Design a protein around this ligand. Structure first.
Ligand SMILES: *C[C@@H](CCN(C)C)C(=O)NC[C@@H](NC(=O)[C@H](Cc1nc2ccc(C(C)C)cc2s1)NC(=O)CC)C1CCCCC1
Length: 349
């Protein structure tokens, strides 16, 4: 009920991540040292986690956070009268506000809280949409406002239904939890894109998809909600913003590094040469002048696999390397494969 509401608005992460602090699940703050976070989580769960938890372990930490939020609200002079007057569904919507911006942030909506306390649902819902909170998270705010306006889970129910009905269009007949090859095909067809195109790879990056030719129920549901999409037309309008992000070097590095993890076979530490070249021609297109000469060099002098470090450093190489390769330091920390490439390419100019 409340867990699924904030799973939709805030998101669920089974692995340890950084905000702006070490975090897990639905925004559970662990500490303020990765070893201290792993130890704090270990004590909280009662097992050797290594920074990876389950949905049930995430719900246990969330229920602790709910109790912490309820305790907090009741100790606040501006929020306690309102919380007491509200019903179970609207209390969950108030907790959602506290989870998003803290007590002092919620206390700022004095006029709106006043209306909620006076049970003027339609009057409160209108005034709450006027604020910057509506501009910031239009998908989240609309869902919380609708909860305050009706006192029902309709906003979250409708979205889940709209998504789950759309999921049935791509799920594998032999496997419920995943979207098969044919379903991935349908998804790309419905979005009018080739499944082997850059746009689909950009989508996979925003969706945080684990492996190529594989799409899980979780990855679909989480990705679609996070981007604020309940239809294929909505995701299609999102693609240009995703594209424009790559013009920023920081976002492109994250995308380039993600490509290696997405392209690699599960169980392999490295990436197959033929697969690596195919993705390099896709992500380093119009970014690496020596891209074709590099592929040619690999196919003839390196029949072996591609490690993560060599993949990541080739971007740093492409950016730095001069058209005549003069600025290259033959003894300057670059991998041997790149050393061999400059030695191979330089006599050819
Ligand atoms: C996937 C792979 C099987 C590897 N086996 C060991 C043979 C395969 O057949 N790859 C061929 C091709 N890859 C693609 O076309 C993939 C297909 C997609 N997979 C997903 C997964 C999730 C999503 C969601 C985010 C919607 C979408 C897609 S499309 N497409 C991509 O990787 C995007 C570029 C590769 C494509 C690059 C050229 C070499 C062959």
């Amino acid at each position: 009920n409340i867990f699924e509401m904030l799973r939709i608005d805030e998101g669920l992460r089974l692995k340890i991540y950084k905000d702006t602090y070490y975090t897990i699940g639905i925004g559970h703050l662990l500490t303020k040292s990765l070893n201290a976070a792993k130890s704090e989580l270990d004590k909280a769960i009662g097992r050797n986690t290594n920074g990876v938890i389950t949905k049930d372990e995430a719900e246990k930490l969330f229920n602790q956070d709910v109790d912490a939020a309820v305790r907090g609200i009741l100790r606040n002079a501006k929020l306690k009268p309102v919380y007491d007057s509200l019903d179970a569904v609207r209390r969950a919507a108030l907790i959602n506000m506290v989870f998003q911006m803290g007590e002092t942030g919620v206390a700022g909506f004095t006029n709106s809280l006043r209306m909620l306390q006076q049970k003027r649902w339609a009057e409160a819902a209108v005034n709450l949409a006027k604020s910057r909170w509506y501009n910031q998270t239009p998908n989240r705010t609309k869902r919380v406002i609708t909860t305050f306006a009706t006192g029902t889970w309709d906003a979250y129910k409708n979205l889940r239904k709209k998504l789950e009905q759309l999921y049935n269009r791509y799920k594998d007949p032999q496997d419920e939890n995943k979207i098969g090859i044919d379903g991935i095909q349908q998804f790309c067809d419905d979005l009018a894109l080739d499944p082997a195109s850059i746009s689909v790879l950009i989508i996979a990056w925003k969706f945080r998809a684990a492996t190529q030719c594989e799409f899980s129920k979780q990855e679909f549901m989480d990705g679609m909600t996070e981007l604020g999409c309940d239809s294929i037309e909505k995701l299609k309008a999102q693609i240009p913003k995703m594209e424009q992000e790559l013009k920023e070097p920081g976002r492109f590095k994250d995308f380039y590094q993600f490509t290696f993890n997405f392209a690699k076979n599960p169980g392999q530490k490295g990436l197959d040469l033929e697969m690596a070249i195919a993705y390099w021609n896709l992500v380093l297109n119009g970014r690496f002048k020596f891209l074709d000469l590099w592929n040619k060099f690999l196919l003839e002098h390196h029949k072996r696999s591609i490690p993560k470090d060599t993949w990541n450093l080739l971007l740093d190489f492409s950016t730095m390397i001069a058209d005549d390769m003069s600025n290259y330091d033959e003894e300057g920390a670059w991998p041997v494969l790149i050393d061999d490439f400059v030695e191979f390419a330089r006599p050819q100019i």
